[PDB]
Amino acid sequence: AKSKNHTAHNQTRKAHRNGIKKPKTYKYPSLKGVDPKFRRNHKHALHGTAKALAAAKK
């Protein structure tokens, strides 16, 4: 007793019922996979920048 192996029938209808939404885009995306040599400096630079603005409008 053979059967039907594969078809993509009805799959686009199904997907487009609640479907093809773009995921979304945020400000400040993840730094994941980014170079650690860059991340390690960015940490210190942001620390210094916060310190500088604090002492500036202190």
Partner: peptide, 20 residues
């Protein structure tokens, strides 16, 4: 999204079923 010695990090949007 990233830059290295010889390579470049690229972000792409890929349709997987009913979403990206």
């Amino acid at each position: 999204y990233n830059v290295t010695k010889s390579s470049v990090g690229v972000i792409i949007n890929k349709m997987v079923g009913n979403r990206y």
